[PDB]
């Protein structure tokens, strides 16, 4: 995808993440765990439902039209009736093919983007207290217990509290 | 003494193949079908008013072939002509049959 | 039974935007196309393995 996260610096997806589309796994002094990220998951779901609802909205209603099957050879007028219909069908078939190609390219890119946005947001919270290991994981350079991990996950992590400890570990 | 925090996304053992701009087939976690390809094989009688022609064409009902006179003064949203229809009155033709049939049907 | 869309094959659902049942239709109907299937992705790339 365009952002290089999904099938990129994130090496693979997690079959064990069964309660969200995007999320976190951690290891700290209290063990390991996993949690779905609700906001990123819902942003992707909401965009996908948005495009689905635009696509499946409003079939056209048509009533009396032209005949499209014929039991006798007639020549010129029938030739034209059949050509008009064949022309119409080929144009709609082209629209249908192109629509799903464009939509699908974009769905892959928007989901890749949501992964990348979560990663960047997490990085920004951590400031100088962590480093990007290059595989979608952050090495956090301070003791970070379950409540600390949850503070990152819920967006209230206070980098200043841990900065002295982390810098000592990173740089000295 | 520290911790590791990994970001990730879900996956399933087998997803669905779709087409994109650059790929004829690529696997995603889920997709939905946009082409209706099946029918029950029955015409539903609601909400449209359906008139089954049975043994009669619309033109035979129009003219009043006796076995079609059941259809006198009938109305429809959709008239359904059956392949088993037959004429049983004076033999006739209609120059521009298709147009008379169309304008009455409409 | 109830259906907005009628084809000579029978009624069909009209929740999808396209259909490949019959070019002849009456009512609120999906548009006839040649393809017998077209899948709209509703999830991200599935990457269970590297």
């Amino acid at each position, epitope marked *: 995808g365009l952002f290089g996260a999904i099938a990129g610096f994130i090496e693979n997806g997690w079959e064990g993440m069964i309660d969200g589309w995007y999320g976190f796994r951690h290891q700290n002094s209290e063990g390991t765990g996993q949690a779905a990220d609700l906001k990123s998951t819902q942003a992707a779901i*909401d965009q996908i*439902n948005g495009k689905l*609802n635009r696509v499946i909205e409003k079939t056209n209603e048509k009533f009396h039209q032209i005949e499209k099957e014929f039991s006798e050879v007639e020549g010129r007028i029938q030739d034209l009736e059949k050509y008009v219909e064949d022309t119409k069908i080929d144009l709609w078939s082209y629209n249908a093919e192109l629509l799903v190609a464009l939509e699908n390219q974009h769905t892959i890119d928007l989901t890749d983007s949501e992964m990348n946005k979560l990663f960047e947001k997490t990085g920004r919270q951590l400031r100088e207290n962590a480093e990007d290991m290059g595989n979608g994981c952050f090495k956090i350079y301070h003791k970070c217990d379950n409540a600390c991990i949850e503070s990152i996950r819920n967006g209230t992590y206070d980098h200043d509290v841990y900065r002295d400890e982390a810098l000592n570990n990173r740089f000295q | 003494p520290g911790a590791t925090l990994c970001l990730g996304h879900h996956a399933v053992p087998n997803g669905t193949l779709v087409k994109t701009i650059t790929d004829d087939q690529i696997e995603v976690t889920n997709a939905t079908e946009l082409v209706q390809s099946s029918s029950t094989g029955k015409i539903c009688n609601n909400p449209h008013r359906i008139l089954d022609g049975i043994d009669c064409t619309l033109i035979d009902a129009l003219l009043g072939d006796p076995h079609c006179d059941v259809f006198q003064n009938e109305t429809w949203d959709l008239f359904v002509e059956r392949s088993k229809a037959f004429s049983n009155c004076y033999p006739y033709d209609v120059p521009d049959y298709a147009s008379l049939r169309s304008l009455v049907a409409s | 039974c109830i259906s907005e869309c009628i084809t000579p094959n029978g009624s069909i659902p009209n929740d999808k935007p396209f259909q490949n049942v019959n070019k002849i239709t009456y009512g609120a109907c999906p548009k006839y196309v040649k393809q017998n299937t077209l899948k709209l992705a*509703t999830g991200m790339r599935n990457v269970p393995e590297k």
Partner: antibody
Amino acid sequence: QVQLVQSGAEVKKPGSSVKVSCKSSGGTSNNYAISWVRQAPGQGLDWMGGISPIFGSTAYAQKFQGRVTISADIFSNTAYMELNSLTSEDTAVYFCARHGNYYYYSGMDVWGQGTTVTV
Amino acid sequence: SALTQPPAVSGTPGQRVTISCSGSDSNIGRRSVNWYQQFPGTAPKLLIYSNDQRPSVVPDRFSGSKSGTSASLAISGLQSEDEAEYYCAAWDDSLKGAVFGGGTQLTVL
């Protein structure tokens, strides 16, 4: 402002099945989880399960697993609950309710009017 | 069950009333609590979510809190229109499903 509108009251004989619908009007609910919650006469609320149809999740309470089928039609913006093998223990009002997001943890903030099922 | 509430609470107009909700580690302990209000024969209404968060349409006299494996709904300044059934709720990670308390009937004296 979305409203959830449920199908009408049902009277059912023992062993039969009932399928209740929940239509989202005034907007879609396809990007949210909708749960089904029942309330037996004089009793409390009881979760049956839920569905989040674009996300692709259907969940069931263990106590109803195998007897209930929850489904959705994203094109008509409707969710459904079908409960099989009915007995008098299933006489209850059945509600559909939409969660604040795509999954079942969030508070249920939009509720249908309820559907009475009498067995 | 799973969550346990007193069957009944009462108060006078203007009084402060509290409704308790006892759970376990698999629900209240590790998950967020929601509270619902229900008038007879009508659908429940969301009153509190995420433990202490209040929807904009809900009066500020309603508040919630969570400590350990317990939760509490407080109604400051009781009004007559508050006579209703109240339910606590949370996800349960052991049952893998949503659970509710048995409900508390509030009577305005």
